[PDB]
Amino acid sequence: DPILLRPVDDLELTVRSANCLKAEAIHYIGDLVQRTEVELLKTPNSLTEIKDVLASRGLSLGMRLENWPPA
Amino acid sequence: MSKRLPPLNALRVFDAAARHLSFTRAAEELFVTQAAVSHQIKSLEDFLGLKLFRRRNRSLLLTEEGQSYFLDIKEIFSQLTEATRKLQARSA
Amino acid sequence: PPLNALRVFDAAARHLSFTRAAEELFVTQAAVSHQIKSLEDFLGLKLFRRRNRSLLLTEEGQSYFLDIKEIFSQLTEATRKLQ
Amino acid sequence: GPEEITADIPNVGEAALSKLDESGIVYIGAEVTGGDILVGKVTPKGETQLTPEEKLLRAIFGEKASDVKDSSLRVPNGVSGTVIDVQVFTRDGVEKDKRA
Amino acid sequence: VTEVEIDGVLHEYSTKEGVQEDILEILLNLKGLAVRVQGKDEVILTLNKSGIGPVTAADITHDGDVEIVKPQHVICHLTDENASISMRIKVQRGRGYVPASTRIHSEEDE
Amino acid sequence: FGIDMNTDYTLEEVGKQFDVTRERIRQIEAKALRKLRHPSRSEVLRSFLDD
Secondary structure, three states: OOOOOOEOOOOOOOHHHHHHHHHOOOOEHHHHHHOOHHHHOOOOOOOOOHHHHHHOOOOOOOOOOOOOOOO | OOOOOOOOOHHHHHHHHHHHOOHHHHHHOOOOOOHHHHHHHHHHHHHHOOOOEEEEOOEEEEOHHHHHHHOOOHHHHHHHHHHHHHHHHHHO | OOOOOHHHHHHHHHOOOOHHHOOOOOOOOOHHHHHHHHHHHHOOOOOEEEOOOOEEEOHHHHHHHHHHHHHHHHHHHHHHHHO | OOOEOOOOOOOOOOOHHHHEOOOOEEOOOOEEEOOOEEEOOEEOOOOOOOOHHHHHHHHHHOOOOOOOEEOOEEOOOOOEEEOOOOOOOOOOOOOOOOOO | OOEEEEOOOOOOOOOOOOEOOOHHHHHHHHOOOOEEEOOOOEEEEEEEEEOOEEEOHHHEOOOOOEEEOOOOOOOEEEOOOOOEEEEEEEEEOOOOOOOOHHHHHHOOOO | OOOOOOOOOOHHHHHOOOOOOHHHHHHHHHHHHHHHOOOOOHHHHHHHHOO
8 A cells, every 4th residue: 555654744634633643653654543533632733624535545443454663 | 733632621620520529519619519520520531541530428439530630720720820810910 | 822832943043043943843944933923913923033034032032031941840740750 | 177986976876886896997707798888988077058947956955966976987888707807007196096 | 506705815816925827717617517406596605725735626615415426526626735715606597607796686685 | 036027026126016024025035045045946956056
C-alpha cells in the first residue's frame, strides 16, 4: 500500500485536526489508522471530518495490520 | 508524551464527597447538581482503573482502591487558591 | 484558574516567550495567551514582562513557576502509581 | 574566475565519481567507458536570468544554483578503454595539486 | 581463466622487473590452461614463483579437487634472481565463448 | 513571480491592490509553499531539480 509509508502530512486536514494528532505523536498514516474511533474521541480539539477526509483517499479507520511498523 | 492531567472538576467534588458523607449534600457546597458528580468519576477512572467508593445503606465508606488517590488531590486546590490570593493581594 | 492554564504557564518561562512555548505544548502560538488573559482576572496580576523582543522574568511569576512544579511533580507521583 | 580541477561537481552522482581521487583525477589503470568523467573541471557560472517558472521551483524546494558551472572532461561516447597514463603540466606560480 | 590479479600490476599494459614478456603476453599464455574442476562450479587459484627460469603450471599451489592436465605449459619467464611473481587465478565453469564485455556489463559491482 | 505577465510584484505592490496586510500576504505565500511542498503534488515537480 502506497499510503502506509507516508507521514500524516498527506491529508490536508484542518488545523484543529492537524494539531490534535501531534499530541499523541502520530507519525504514520498506518499509525493513525490502527487506532479506532472509540479512543480518539478522548483527545480535545473531528468526528464529522475524519471519515470524509479519509474516504476520498480510499482508506478508513478500524483496519487491522500486522508487521507494523516494518521500518 | 502529552501529559493527560485529571479534569479540573472531578477533584474538588471528590474531596467534599468524603467530608459531606453524602453525594447529594456534596453538590450544594459546589453550587452544582448531584448528577454532575457521577459524570466526572468515569472520566477520571480512565487513568485510575479503581473504584472510588463502596456502596453502603444511607452511608459512605472508604475503599482502599480510591484511597491511594485521595492523598494526592487535597493539596492541589489548597495551593492554587493560595496562588490566586498572592497575585490578588500583591495587585492591591 | 483552569488546570488547562496550568500547563501553559510552565512552558512559557522555560521557552522565554509565549510564542516560543508552542512547539512542546502541542498547540499554536495564539492559545498560549488565551489562558493567561483569564489569569489576570481570576488571580488578577501580571506574570511576565510583555515586550516585543522577549519577556523579563518576574519574581512573582517564578514563585508560581515553582508552584507549577509542585503541582506536576506530585502529579507524576499519581502517574507512577499507575505505572 | 579561474577554472579549477576538483571532485566537487554539482548535479552528478557520487558513483560516477568513485573512479577519481580527492583531487578529481582518475586513477591509473582504471577501466573507463564513454560518458565517464576522467577529470573534473568547474568553470565559474555567470548570473542567470531566471524564468518565471524556475523561480517558483527555487522558492518551493530551495535549491539555489551557486556560482559554479560544470565544464568537466568526459570520455567520448563509444570508447571503452583503460587509462594507462596521466600527464599533468602546471604553470610556474600556480600551486600544483596533490596528483602533480 | 576469467580473472587474474597480480600484485604491483595495475593494468594489462604495464611491465614488471625480471619478467621477460609483457603482462598482455602473460594473459595470452593464461588463455590456454587445461584445468578441470571436479566438485564445485568455480575455483580460485594462486601462483607464486621466485627465481630465474620459465614458469609452468607446476608452480601453482595444487588443490585436492583441482586437476591440471598440462604441467609443462609455459606461462612466463623470470630473468632476475630477485624477481618474484605472485598472481591469482580465477577459473570458472561455463560453455561457449564469453568476451570481456558482457562480464562487466552484467556485474554492476565496482 | 510574474508568471504569464511582464514583471513580478512585491509585497506592497500586491498589498495596495487587495489588502495592506504585510505579513499576511507572506503567510499566504508560506501556505502556498507548504501546499506545494506536500508529497501529493510535488511528485512530478521534484524531477526538475537536476536542470
